[PDB]
Design a protein around this motif. Structure first.
Motif, short mmCIF file in Angstrom:
data_model
loop_
_atom_site.label_atom_id
_atom_site.label_comp_id
_atom_site.label_asym_id
_atom_site.label_seq_id
_atom_site.Cartn_x
_atom_site.Cartn_y
_atom_site.Cartn_z
N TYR B 97 -112.66 41.81 -16.86
CA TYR B 97 -113.29 42.84 -16.03
C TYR B 97 -113.08 42.55 -14.55
CZ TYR B 97 -116.79 46.05 -14.25
OH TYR B 97 -117.44 47.05 -13.57
N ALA B 98 -113.27 41.30 -14.15
CA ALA B 98 -113.10 40.94 -12.74
C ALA B 98 -111.67 41.17 -12.28
CB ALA B 98 -113.51 39.49 -12.52
N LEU B 101 -111.14 44.92 -11.82
CA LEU B 101 -111.77 45.38 -10.59
C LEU B 101 -110.98 44.93 -9.37
CD1 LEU B 101 -114.03 46.62 -8.98
CD2 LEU B 101 -115.39 44.59 -9.37
N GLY B 163 -112.82 47.48 -15.88
CA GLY B 163 -112.91 46.99 -14.52
C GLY B 163 -112.14 47.86 -13.55
N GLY B 167 -113.44 50.32 -10.59
CA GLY B 167 -112.97 50.00 -9.26
C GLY B 167 -112.46 51.17 -8.45
N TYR B 238 -120.97 36.20 -11.92
CA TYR B 238 -120.14 37.40 -11.98
C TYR B 238 -120.64 38.49 -11.04
CZ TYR B 238 -117.87 35.35 -16.05
OH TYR B 238 -117.15 34.53 -16.88
N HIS B 242 -118.24 40.11 -8.19
CA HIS B 242 -117.97 41.53 -8.02
C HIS B 242 -118.12 41.95 -6.57
CE1 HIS B 242 -117.68 41.39 -12.20
NE2 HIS B 242 -118.74 42.09 -12.57
N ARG B 246 -115.17 43.29 -4.07
CA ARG B 246 -115.29 44.56 -3.37
C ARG B 246 -115.32 44.40 -1.86
NH1 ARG B 246 -116.22 49.18 -5.42
NH2 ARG B 246 -116.58 49.51 -7.66
#
Ligand SMILES: C[C@@H]1C[C@@H]([C@H](O)CC2CC(=O)NC(=O)C2)C(=O)[C@@H](C)C1
Ligand SMILES: [Zn+2]
Lengths: 103, 292, 159, 144
Positions: B97-98, B101, B163, B167, B238, B242, B246
């Motif tokens: 997921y990271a 993103l 992700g 994003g 986590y 995130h 970002r």
RNA sequence: GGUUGCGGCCAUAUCUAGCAGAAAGCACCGUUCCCCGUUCGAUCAACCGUAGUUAAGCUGCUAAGAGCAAUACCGAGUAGUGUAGUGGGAGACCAUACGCGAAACUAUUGUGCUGCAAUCU
RNA sequence: CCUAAGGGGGACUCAUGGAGAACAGAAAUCUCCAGUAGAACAAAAGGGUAAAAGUCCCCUUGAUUUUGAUUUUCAGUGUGAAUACAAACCAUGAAAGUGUGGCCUAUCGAUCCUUUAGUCCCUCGGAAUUUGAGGCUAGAGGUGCCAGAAAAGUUACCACAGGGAUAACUGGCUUGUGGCAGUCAAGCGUUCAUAGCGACAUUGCUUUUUGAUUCUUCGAUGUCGGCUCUUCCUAUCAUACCGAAGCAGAAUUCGGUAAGCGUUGGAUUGUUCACCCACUAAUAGGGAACGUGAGCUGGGUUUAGACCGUCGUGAGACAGGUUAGUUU
RNA sequence: GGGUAAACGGCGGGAGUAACUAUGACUCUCUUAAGGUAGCCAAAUGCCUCGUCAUCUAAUUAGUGACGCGCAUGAAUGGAU
RNA sequence: GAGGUAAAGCGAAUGAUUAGAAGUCUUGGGGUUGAAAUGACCUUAACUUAUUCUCAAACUUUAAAUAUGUAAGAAGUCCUUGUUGCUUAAUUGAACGUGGACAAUUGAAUGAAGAGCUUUUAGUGGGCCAUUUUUGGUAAGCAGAACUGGCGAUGCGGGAUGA
């Protein structure tokens, strides 16, 4: 050939205009009326003397008829007609095939 | 007793498969379906989110196809995550997921679509698509490419998918492959998906194993033990990752301790070199002479 | 019983090349065709959709329509004493760019490049291609090349 | 037949000048079984143009009896005389196409002395068709 | 230069038998709470990168190697063929004139090149 | 033919061989290795297809709606079939995508009439209502001689218009078949290839067989055989003169120059052909519009009468038999 | 459903079998509405066919007398005289 | 660009096919070994390996000649930037343009009793022959095709005579 009893196809109805459930059944041609202009015309041309005035077909060659499916929409009751190919055998809602079975 | 099969005729008429098909790496059926573009959109390229999982790494590239070969738009690696605060479990579903993103934010910053299409800010596990902003550029559209990897509900590739979709990339998908999807009741459980997003399954494993099999806990979750990372505070790792991604998704290449020429000279030392035609002629002559 | 079906007589024309069966390389699906391009038609047997008729196998035409997976090609066919424009829909697997364009398009740019320079240098230059002319006079020197005398050989059986 | 029509050889004993290139050589190769060709000398060209020289003026066959006729039709190509035209033909010049097309195809007579026993075979095998390369001059002297 | 990911051309890249491989990568490798899939956690899924290994995969090199590719004072201007003759021959067929022109065979050489991104003693 | 053998997705790899496992063996099931397709893909053949177009599993109805464009056959008409899109509505898949029946090349059908569906619309014309009828758009009911009449024979009692575009004689091309003649020489011949024969092969000639063809003739060339008469050919049966022999004589066989000269009388049959009896030097073979009907004859075939057998319900047929039948 | 053939008409095949062979009184077999009886025959009806035997003649595809699994004889579609 | 005919090939796939040689028979029999051992030996036949002779309208890796498609400019190329409801993440494109430059070598040869366009109507819809390619047939002044040229519809010189 084998066709299921139901089918979800496009409906022509003004308030359907989409895919809906239909009940499939076979088309049977209606009996010829005695008051149709063609019959009503042909019954007078046959009267009197002269014999047989119109052709009578004898040289038949086909052995199969195209099967027509009369689809009943379950929502708006609008019928539809679908022709199939020529098949010598046709049943509606028969036993589905079983693949991988013994004789 | 039977015909020897590998004859010269067998070799002569053999049609070798494509180079990357004999490598067992490229499925050209799926590649044809993915790459080929509607001919009336003449030179506009289709973009593939190529997601690959190694034994130690996650690679997520954005690729467009050309006759000379595929061209990489942007790329995100799992081994980038240590810069963003994730050091362990770089192949989690949550690490996936990271990475998704990160690639989404990095591509959007490269294009300039940052103010618009920020993405799902409050990660809740809800299924959602990147919706276009009216009277503005459409969201960057990317199609997922999983290669030869099997599609199973709960697979890690769809973690990268989720992700990237959160994003700001517009990656079309249905939520029936996310962990937390009920097939019998065809709806997606948001809480279980959220748990998987923030490492909840790893934390649950640490909790369960710590009080049940502590030796296996010491062997498996060692890096967490030396890090004084408990089961409860993994979610915040986590969560901070995130926010950090970002905040700044730009690419920082690793500083290289040697130049390209130094690497080339070092590597060329351990490479055998082909013989001269004269050398092998001499070898043949020597062998014949020693045969008498 | 004469048979004149759609694919009659295409036993060899629609065959794949030897050791070239199977999947299509994707450079075929990556080429871009614009309306007005000159393309060659060569039916690929492995793709049975959008296949040209056997007449158009090997013909060259102009793209006039571009659709999702196909191009519309214009071919002039002799039907009696005149030509008829045919409009064939072909999947791009059966179509390739004609190389005759590029050599001429190169000469268009080459000619302009040479011509503008001649104006710059205050001279003139002739741009028309010329057929191979007869060769001019030359002198053949014989150092190391004294003529060898050859004679016809006697008959002899070689089995 | 089409090749002979493009060379303007529409009747027997009709002669024309052709500048040799690959294209025209391949043209002549197709017409070889019906024509005799060769490399003409200067005197042959002069005799041909003097005795049988006609120009194409408004699609009409006009005798070259004065230099005014030649000038009025080839002045823009700097041909001002019968000698200018002969020089343009002999040393194949820049304006060879216009000068040679201006000349009406020469209408020779049958040879005085005849051909060989059989014509329609190659000059190498005792015929008359094909390339004879300097013997075109003797044939033209027979024929003009 | 090595390696990875994605490729282009699709054997000069394939195949057989051997040998070597520093760094990194890849890989084999360990476990079954969770998502998931099986007669079988073998394949597939998830988790650890922690316990181990370059054994294999992978890469390179070797072979009067097979195959493939290319070239030719190789065969051969041969076979074949367009055009021609009130040529030859009973015929079958053949020669000649102006043009075009193979395949096998023989010999020699070669054995992937390359694009984008990242990484590395 | 197929509700899957259509559509989508996924997983897998086939024929075969080798090496192994209780019953188990050439053939059961299981395992590994090899395995470029040597399998399968409804049905002919061809093409195509390998992380598939093949095998198996999941979901399905796109085998749906509207009407255009295009390709093939082509007149660039129809029918069939197919292709690529547009506007919808859906299936499947994570998704890109794919799907307008069957992997592709065959698997099908006008006008009129009937019938059904759709639109529930238009009309029934002095004005309405309701039945009934007629319209508009799409299917079905069928024409296989498949651009699509409704259709049993016979004529030996026959007719007409034509045809040498077309058969039954001659002729012409050909010579398979018929006939005749060579070349080679394995053998036969007491030994001995070749006195006389001569297999397996092979080269020809002839137009006296029958074919093949359909060039001439259908505003007619009188189409069987015999009798009568002339002439020609030679591939010679006899007669002249010879050469050879498995020629002692006699007889006979093979061959040459030779067509000058002859080649018969009868029984049976319409016969040609045949088959006997007998004589003879011998009773050779052919041609001449299959010589020869304003030369004959008319037995035959092949008009009309009649009978029989078989066949046909019948009229009638028979290249089956029989008898009577104008020859200018 | 019954009757009717001096109504129209019809009236079968295959195997083995008798102290030589030959044949088949006989048996078995399928099948019909019935399976051609009395008679007659190479007959104006028999293809093969100029059937075979005898007679007639020197010689007979003719004639006559026989024979008979008779292509395809036969009883008022009259049979034999 | 396209092609799969001629040729070629068969120690290249399919199919056909001649001859030996060396091997395996362990999943061929015969004979001879054995008081009974399938464990040998001589043999033929099978297969396997490397060779060998000869073929293919409905075989093929290869592959001509002739014939065949397209292009060789002004309706072109290039530079700049206007329209759209199509397309792109987009200011990206796609299509059509505005304005500007490039003239007689304006972009191969040769030729052009000129090019283009239309209406209307006749006769014809039995063909035959020659070279070359070719199918059926023993063949044919036979039957049926391919390309061209002829005769028909055409005299004249030559082939004595002859579409
Ligand atoms: C055989 C049956 C009838 C046939 C048709 O009505 C025969 C008609 C045709 C026509 O136009 N006029 C006539 O006199 C006869 C048809 O269509 C079929 C489908 C169904
Ligand atoms: Zn409805």
């Amino acid at each position: 050939v084998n066709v299921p009893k139901t089918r979800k196809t496009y409906c022509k109805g003004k308030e359907c205009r989409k895919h809906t459930q239909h009940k499939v059944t076979q088309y049977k041609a209606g009996k010829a009326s005695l008051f149709a202009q063609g019959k009503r015309r042909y019954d007078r041309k046959q009267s009197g003397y002269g014999g047989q005035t119109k052709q009578i077909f004898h040289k038949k060659a086909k052995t199969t008829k195209k099967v027509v499916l009369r689809l009943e929409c379950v929502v708006c009751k609008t019928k539809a007609q679908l022709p199939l190919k020529r098949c010598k055998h046709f049943e509606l809602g028969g036993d589905k095939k079983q693949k991988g079975q013994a004789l | 007793m039977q015909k020897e099969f590998r004859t010269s005729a067998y070799h002569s008429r053999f049609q070798t498969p494509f180079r990357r098909r004999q490598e067992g790496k490229t499925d050209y059926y799926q590649r044809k379906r993915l790459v080929t573009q509607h001919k009336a959109k003449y030179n506009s390229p289709k973009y593939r989110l190529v997601v690959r999982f190694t034994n130690k790494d996650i690679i997520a590239q954005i690729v467009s196809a050309h006759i000379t070969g595929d061209v990489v738009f942007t790329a995100a690696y799992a081994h980038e995550l240590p810069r963003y605060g994730i050091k362990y479990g770089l192949t989690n579903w949550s690490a996936a997921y990271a990475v998704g993103l990160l690639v989404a934010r990095r591509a959007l910053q490269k294009l300039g679509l940052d103010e618009t299409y920020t993405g799902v800010e409050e990660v809740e596990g809800e299924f959602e698509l990147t919706e276009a902003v009216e009277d503005g550029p459409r969201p960057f559209k990317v199609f997922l490419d999983i290669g030869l990897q099997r599609t199973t509900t709960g697979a890690r590739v769809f973690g990268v998918l989720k992700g990237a979709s959160d994003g700001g990339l517009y990656v079309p998908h249905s939520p029936n492959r996310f962990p937390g999807w009920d097939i019998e009741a065809e709806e997606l459980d948001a809480e279980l998906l959220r748990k998987y997003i923030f490492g909840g399954h790893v934390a649950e494993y640490m909790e369960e194993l710590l009080d049940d099999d502590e030796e296996k806990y010491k062997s498996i979750f060692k890096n967490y033990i030396e890090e004084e990372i408990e089961s409860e505070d993994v979610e915040e790792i986590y969560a901070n990752a995130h926010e950090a991604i970002r905040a700044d998704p730009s690419f920082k290449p690793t500083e290289k301790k040697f130049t390209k020429e130094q690497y080339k000279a070092e590597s060329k030392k351990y490479r055998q070199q082909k013989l001269t035609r004269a050398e092998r002629q001499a070898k043949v002559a020597k062998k014949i002479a020693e045969f008498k | 019983g004469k048979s004149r079906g759609y694919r009659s007589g295409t036993r060899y024309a629609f065959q794949r090349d030897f050791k070239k069966h199977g999947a299509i390389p994707l450079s075929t699906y990556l080429k871009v065709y614009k309306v007005g391009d000159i393309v060659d038609i060569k039916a690929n047997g492995s793709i049975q959709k959008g296949m040209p008729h056997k007449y158009y196998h090997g013909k060259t035409g102009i793209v006039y329509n571009v659709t999702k997976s196909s191009v519309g090609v214009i071919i002039n066919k002799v039907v009696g004493n005149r030509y008829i424009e045919k409009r064939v829909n072909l999947r791009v697997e059966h179509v390739k760019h004609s190389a005759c364009r590029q050599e001429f398009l190169n000469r268009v740019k080459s000619n302009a490049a040479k011509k503008r320079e001649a104006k710059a240098n205050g001279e003139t230059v002739y741009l028309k291609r010329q057929a191979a002319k007869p060769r001019g006079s030359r002198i053949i020197s014989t150092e190391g090349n004294i003529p060898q005398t050859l004679a016809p050989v006697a008959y002899e059986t070689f089995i | 037949r089409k090749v002979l029509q493009l060379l303007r050889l529409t009747q027997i004993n009709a002669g024309v000048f052709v500048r040799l290139t690959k294209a025209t050589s391949e043209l002549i190769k197709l017409a070889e079984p019906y024509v005799a060709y060769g490399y003409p000398s200067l005197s042959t060209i002069r005799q041909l143009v003097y005795k049988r020289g006609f120009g194409k003026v408004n699609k009409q066959r006009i005798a070259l009896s004065d230099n005014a006729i030649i000038e009025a039709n080839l002045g823009k190509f700097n041909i001002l005389s019968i000698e200018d035209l002969i020089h343009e033909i002999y040393t194949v010049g820049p304006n060879f196409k216009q000068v040679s097309n201006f000349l009406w195809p020469f209408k020779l007579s049958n040879p005085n002395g005849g051909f060989r026993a059989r014509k329609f075979q190659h000059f190498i095998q005792g015929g008359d068709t094909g390339n004879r390369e300097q013997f075109i001059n003797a044939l033209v002297k027979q024929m003009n």
